[PDB]
A = this chain, B = another copy of it.
Amino acid sequence: DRVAQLTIGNSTITTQEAANIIVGYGEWPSYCSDSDATAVDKPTRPDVSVNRFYTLDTKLWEKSSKGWYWKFPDVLTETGVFGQNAQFHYLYRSGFCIHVQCNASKFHQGALLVAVLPEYVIGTVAGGTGTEDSHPPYKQTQPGADGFELQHPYVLDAGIPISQLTVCPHQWINLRTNNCATIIVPYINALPFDSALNHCNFGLLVVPISPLDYDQGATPVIPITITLAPMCSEFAGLRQAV
């Protein structure tokens, strides 16, 4: 009976689940009172048009799915008015409300680990047995709004153990218990502003740790819907031409 409305776009969702909302590193997104000049040409802080409810195309969870990831702000970099601001500016800074939701029956099974990893650098294979230095293409490093599937979830496609991914801001989605997860991410960088199109401040991982299962006859694919809203987006730069 609860419909959460923010903007021009409206979303129906139950809140706040099993463990409430996870605020990453105990820190809400904030504007930039501090940095850096201060110049008159200083940040352009839009609201609430740009900072609205963006819902990506749904992903289909399967018995054999290895997991997916998205890069920020690369996901929205070509999406709507946020996409417009990110492209035709020089400096960028923002926080995010990330919301991941499943729709499944009480007869389905499985557990997703949803986590946020700052500076998520991808490493691909150098040959199954060998040392060939190839670096991932744009389709893999900056996979856009469509995201990308993990090749080796155990090492998070970066030689780093997923068993310890819970050191990052995270929330579990156990179909048995909850169908949704919300994570709040502040701007995290060694600089106050950076390039939106050349630097991805963090990655969003959604990995099945307990595989999807069901008896035959039930819907064989479970939808994972992702809604995300930028929170204290700030655009310096000025003019640009694609």
Contact = CB atoms under 8 A, between A and B. Distances in A.
Interface of A: 8, 41, 44, 49, 238
3 contacts: A8-B41, A8-B238, A44-B49
Majority secondary structure of chain A interface residues (helix, strand, loop or mixed): loop
Nearest to A41: B8
Contacts of A238: 8
A239 to B, nearest CB: 9
A38 to B, nearest CB: 17
A57 to B, nearest CB: 19
A8 B8 CA distance: 28
Nearest to A238: B8
Contacts of A49: 44
Nearest to A239: B8
A44 B46 CA distance: 13
Contacts of A41: 8
Instruction: Report, nearest first, the 3 A-B pairs whose CB atoms are least far apart.
Output: A8-B238, A44-B49, A8-B41
A44 B49 CA distance: 10
A174 to B, nearest CB: 38
A52 to B, nearest CB: 13
